[PDB]
Amino acid sequence: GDTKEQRILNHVLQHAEPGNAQSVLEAIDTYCEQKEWAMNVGDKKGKIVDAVIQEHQPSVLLELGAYCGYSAVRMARLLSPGARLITIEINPDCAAITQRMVDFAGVKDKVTLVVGASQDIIPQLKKKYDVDTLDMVFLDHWKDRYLPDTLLLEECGLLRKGTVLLADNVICPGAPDFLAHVRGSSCFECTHYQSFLEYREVVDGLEKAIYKGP
């Protein structure tokens, strides 16, 4: 008598340690491996996300698509006080799960969750969320929004030289229009990490695209 996202949260509440981000991630990944698949970036691709954050040291991050909060918890746990991870989530029930997950994980002081569609919120970031430019963007929402939101981020002046875009699922389910754009454009320098779809033995990959300036 509940939703899958509630079942994931409840599993965390009963199995993970309050305030322990590692333990929250482990409980989510265990539940989704063993009981019900869900579209979290997961532990194998999450290790690649962690390495990108360690390599580029962002302190202002934007996430597109929060779902149950797995990736927000994963990324926020690596950030130091004063860092900001702004996450945009269009589905208000998912947003409600994400806020509870972030709170339980102990990272709420680093996370600003915004309910709404990325295309509506992105142009408000500078004036309403006190953003200058972004250090890193994690794209993980509906894949047909990757390219339009990348273009919007650029038009809105949110990318500086050196901003890191990191996109999940560029192979499966796929983001070919986004890939063709960033790989063909002199405005980006791209790296591809081959990996696997979360919780499955199916090939996937992430693309890192560094903005070079207009």
Ligand X SMILES: Nc1ncnc2c1ncn2[C@@H]1O[C@H](C[C@@H](N)CC[C@H](N)C(=O)O)[C@@H](O)[C@H]1O
Ligand Y SMILES: O=[N+]([O-])c1cc(O)c(O)c([N+](=O)[O-])c1
Confirm or deny that 207 is annotated as ligand binding. no
* 71 contact, one of ligand X, Mg ion, ligand Y, none, CB 5-8 Å limit per kind: ligand X
Q: Which of 5, 140, 149, 207 binds Mg ion (CB under 5 A)?
A: 140
* Distance in Å, CB of 7 to Mg ion, minimum: 19
Confirm or deny that 71 is annotated as ligand binding. yes
Range in contact with ligand Y (rule: CB under 6 A) among 18-26, 90-98, 153-161, 166-174: 166-174
**Residue 66 vs 131, nearer CB to ligand Y:** 66
- Token couple for 49: 């996300």
Confirm or deny that 89 is annotated as ligand binding. yes
**Residue 63 vs 140, nearer CB to Mg ion:** 140
- Beta carbons of 64 and 89 less than 8 angstroms apart: no
Site pattern 111..150 for ligand X (x: CB under 6 A): ------xxx--------------------xxx--x-----
Q: Is the dihedral of CA 162, 208, 53, 17 positive or negative?
A: positive
Catalytic positions, please? Answer: 140, 143, 168-169, 198
**Residue numbers of the site for ligand Y (CB under 6 A)?**
39, 65, 140, 142, 168-169, 173, 197-198
